[PDB]
Design a protein around this ligand. Structure first.
Ligand code: NDP
Ligand code: NDP
Ligand code: CB3
Ligand code: CB3
Ligand code: DHF
Ligand code: DHF
Ligand code: UMP
Ligand code: UMP
Lengths: 508, 508
């Protein structure tokens, strides 16, 4: 037997791979990959064979590839005994005698051409596939990688990467057909004896019917699986509970998520997110605004519910204006400990400006361990339309001049609250970094009460039924002098190709 | 071939298994385990031989064990053809023949007894060794397990369990002799290509030279490993960097640790922990004290350093008395936003009782998601001997009436700070529970700057060279009617057997 792997790079949505004999994009790390993969081998005294269509041979330059043997499939091309590091065959099946001898060849890579992929697949010759998904999708194509036959299952998806503002993943479908017992069993037994008494059982591993792309067992790199998995994790152990809202949830306590911000922008793809809204709110915070209306005007309604005459009236703040939200986030960011009257007053100069002292210590003293911004002020709470969920964040300058962020969130609405929460604090960290001359670090969100509203069940289950695409890229069209200066227009969202929106009602 | 595992239960410290023919303790769950392991089989038509020395046969009642076959090793016992579930052999080596036929016997267990254990081992008959460590060392024994030969390596260790106040582990030692590549390779490659651009590379798996009990790969269940590893994980990616003191540290950002409290007390065993200090400080906080003297008088000198006049002066608080630390934790706990004057004043009635409320909230509103207690108050930081390190915590009542805790720490000194932070916060929860009538739940700790001070390495290296023993148990001797009434006398620390104490100087 001998191994056969396809190696290709297609657009994320339509699988385009070619245009007028050329690749539709130029990503050097990808070829660097293609090289490393096609070339990796055990027997130093052996070489890998890369089968490829002629039309490709032409694009390749009709010149050999170092250390390897090119194998062209053509009907006209002459079997040239001239170069020993290339050879022609009249058809794909015949070419696949590399196994049947030529014991010098260790592995075999089907190396592309729409025609040459489709056939290597139809005739069932390939075992693995090394698929590079390129985020970028709105530009003419004439060649296309086929539809990965159902006999193939994703077993790896690398983290999203970026080159020239083009995002891309490296995932490797394998075709399957067909640590020790000791430990797994000892634990299973100890699991029966002791019951809920063994913490292990309090945290059970999600069932496959609620696991997103369950075929990807050991290589869930893509940091979207940090949320899709927390999702499925409460869906498994979430304990049913009532709460103030009137809509019971399923909740565990003490979770964590992570995100890379260097090569991508953790805007979920398994569902189309309201990015603009996410923004107009985050800026609303930075400005230190608390007038719910200033968002209704830019057509953002995330803060109507917890805002209204009726709700207000109901929680003890009916003395409040239709939409005066009291000293919520922002007022606490820009005016800590300020004596709040109404959303109409001029609060300038009152209260501690955390945000400001933050930027200031950020750039003046980087390795300081007190880059904290908080929103939990006991003295205030009762006046707020709702207490702080993202309660306190802490910011951290790496040695390589990168800004990392840590957020604690007491109550996380995995359905509606989180997607926004992950994005927002990404963006705020970038703005923060751009203003202090540093670049995106990482993102860690620590949740206390991670829950799912019972009326978000059929939805989150669909979302979990979608395989993650590459995270897009977020860019600022200009550098600003003051952090409170950004505008929606100053933002470039590049390469966002999410699944359609999933409608979910809010639990007021 | 055919497997031969040793099953035994010995005291943590001296491996005591015997006393006047009786097990020196009675733990049903342990026996339950034994029954489960010696019955674990694959072929419904086969059985497992359990080998024991006569002396044990006697202790077990000379009655057969359901579903298994007992093999007694004795010189005088007759070869009674009477029972078909029991049989006698003259010498161990003999016996084990078993094997050399009886395709009926699927697995073999040496159910032990000092004389047989020793001999079973010396002649290299045993493949595995299931060992139940029992946290009670201070009783007289007369029979011991032998010393596990070097040829054996621990591959698993269970979390600590508790029965009748007795703490114990379940671990399994395997004997050494001699994922799917495709991924570990595609990931290693992308690792070369991309560099520190691939997040995975900024988080690198610790090297064996610094990994605790590295033989335990997939079975690191003990929750001492939640800290022992965080340690070995900065020791790997720890970015060297300066800070306000003369001692620099190696740090990473965004780490997490988990601890059970339902069956144990996360007191580090790898080294002897000042527990009485951890306490006195906590009770100090609870009372809402800020006079660092009160700790000195009780022979607790942790707040000496950050309290000296030479220090207070150094940070611009020279107007402060010898040890008035200011509105640090406790004043923030019991008097949030209180206008701090001196440590001798009467703050009763001033500020916000967070603790007070936290309690009335835990009792009257459990499912409430705003169970929160903060110490980070922007307005007070300035006049604060040292800013808040355990910055905020959130508490959580399970559906089965257990109290859980979550802590965000902005700056964690894994050398000295963390250890205390883990305990001091176990305890506080347990206390809160005994006062709201709940039982301990889980404890999670989300860290920010996780660092090591560069003058702790030789120490933490030592600590790390030690195999963690089972966690102790901590119970209260009386039910206080008011949280602040607790006293050290009230604490019972049962089953603590930590390795020698490790000296480490603090960085003022
Ligand atoms: N994203 C990726 O990984 C890759 C993308 N691409 C893109 O796709 C394009 C290549 O696709 P495509 O144009 O289909 O070229 P192909 O890779 O399909 O090459 C097919 C060539 O092989 C010969 N051939 C086809 N069938 C047979 C047969 N049965 N027997 C003998 N010879 C045969 C043909 O020449 P003849 O008429 O002489 O038989 C033809 O020129 C390129 O433009 C490139 O941009 C290419 C490779 C990889
Ligand atoms: N904690 C735990 O998991 C366990 C603890 N224990 C404790 O340890 C003690 C074990 O008893 P101990 O006497 O030390 O050992 P055992 O009782 O296991 O075995 C000794 C008996 O086995 C026979 N025997 C063993 N080896 C030989 C041999 N080579 N040739 C002939 N006969 C042999 C002897 O019979 P004879 O003298 O007639 O030749 C002797 O009576 C028990 O008292 C028990 O309390 C026991 C099992 C498990
Ligand atoms: C988190 C957070 C901040 N907030 C503030 C906020 C206020 C009250 C809340 N109440 C409850 N029960 N859960 C919340 O998440 C929540 C969040 C948000 C509020 C609403 C939406 C929301 O309804 N999003 C919908 C609407 C999208 C659209 O308008 O097109 C969505 O599908 O994303 C998002 C964020
Ligand atoms: C954490 C925390 C609270 N605190 C307060 C506190 C204040 C400033 C700090 N500063 C730094 N750099 N690290 C700290 O751990 C630290 C801790 C502690 C302070 C000291 C010790 C300490 O010296 N422990 C020694 C002493 C043991 C003994 O003599 O009994 C130890 O080995 O355990 C522990 C806790
Ligand atoms: N995954 C993948 N990515 C691609 O860009 C790609 C692909 N597969 N399959 C075919 C193809 C088009 N043909 C070719 C032929 C040769 C090289 C090439 O440059 N090979 C060198 C790369 C060395 C480098 O880029 O540093 C090699 O090392 O083999 C690239 C594409 N391109
Ligand atoms: N590791 C270890 N732990 C033990 O507790 C232990 C051990 N090894 N080896 C021998 C032993 C004592 N042997 C036995 C044998 C039978 C019973 C019994 O009456 N019933 C069960 C024991 C546990 C249970 O109650 O289920 C049995 O297996 O026979 C008890 C102790 N106990
Ligand atoms: O930043 C935010 C805004 C609020 N919510 C969700 C969390 C809880 O579902 C919710 C309800 O409120 P509380 O009962 O926890 O206060 O709003 C978020 O998840 N994150
Ligand atoms: O609960 C505690 C008490 C303080 N420290 C240590 C952490 C740092 O070494 C120092 C905090 O000083 P800053 O550099 O973070 O301001 O004290 C702890 O680790 N944990």
């Amino acid at each position: 037997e001998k191994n056969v792997s396809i190696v290709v790079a297609a657009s994320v949505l339509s699988s385009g791979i070619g245009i007028n004999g050329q690749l539709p994009w130029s990503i050097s790390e990808d070829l660097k990959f293609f090289s490393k993969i096609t070339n990796n081998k055990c027997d130093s005294n052996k070489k890998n064979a890369l089968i490829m269509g002629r039309k490709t041979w032409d694009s390749i330059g009709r010149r050999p590839l170092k250390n390897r043997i090119i194998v062209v499939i053509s009907s006209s091309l002459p079997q040239d005994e001239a170069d020993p590091n290339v050879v022609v065959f009249r058809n794909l099946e015949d070419s696949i005698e590399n196994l049947m001898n030529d014991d010098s060849i260790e592995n075999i890579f089907v190396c592309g051409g729409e025609s040459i992929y489709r056939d290597a697949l139809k005739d069932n010759f390939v075992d693995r596939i090394y698929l590079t998904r390129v985020a970028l999708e709105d530009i003419e194509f004439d060649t296309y990688f086929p539809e990965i036959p159902e006999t193939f299952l994703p077993v790896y998806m690398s983290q999203t990467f970026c080159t020239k503002n083009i995002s891309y993943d490296f995932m490797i479908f394998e075709k399957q057909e067909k640590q020790l017992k000791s430990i797994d069993d000892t634990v299973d037994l100890l699991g029966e004896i002791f019951g809920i008494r063994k913490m292990g059982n309090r945290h059970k591993f999600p069932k496959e019917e609620i696991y997103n792309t369950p075929s990807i067992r050991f290589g869930r790199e893509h940091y979207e699986f940090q949320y899709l998995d927390l999702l499925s994790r409460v869906l498994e152990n979430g304990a049913y509970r009532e709460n103030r809202t009137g809509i019971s949830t399923y909740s565990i306590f003490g979770q964590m998520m992570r995100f890379d911000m260097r090569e991508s922008f953790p805007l979920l793809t398994t569902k189309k997110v309201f990015i603009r809204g996410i923004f107009e709110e985050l800026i609303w915070f930075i400005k230190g605004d608390t007038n719910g209306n200033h968002l209704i005007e830019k057509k953002v309604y995330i803060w109507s519910g917890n805002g209204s005459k009726e709700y207000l009236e109901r929680i003890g703040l009916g003395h409040r204006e239709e939409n005066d939200l009291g000293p919520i986030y922002g007022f606490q960011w820009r005016h800590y400990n300020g004596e709040y009257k109404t959303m109409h007053d001029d609060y300038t100069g009152v209260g501690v400006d955390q945000l400001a002292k933050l930027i200031e210590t950020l750039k003046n003293n980087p390795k300081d361990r007190r880059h904290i911004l908080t929103a939990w002020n006991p003295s205030a709470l009762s006046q707020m339309a709702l207490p702080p969920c993202h309660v306190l964040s802490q910011y951290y300058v790496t040695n390589d001049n990168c800004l990392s962020c840590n957020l604690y969130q007491r109550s996380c609405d995995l359905g509606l609250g989180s997607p926004f929460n992950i994005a927002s604090y990404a963006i705020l960290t970038m703005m923060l970094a751009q203003v202090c001359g540093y670049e995106p670090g990482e993102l860690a969100i620590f949740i206390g009460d991670a829950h799912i509203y019972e009326n978000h069940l059929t939805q989150l289950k669909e979302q979990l039924s979608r395989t993650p695409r590459p995270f897009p890229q977020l860019k600022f069209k200009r550098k600003v002098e003051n952090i409170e200066d950004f505008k929606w227009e100053d933002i470039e969202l590049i390469g966002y190709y999410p699944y359609p929106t999933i409608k979910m009602d809010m639990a007021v």
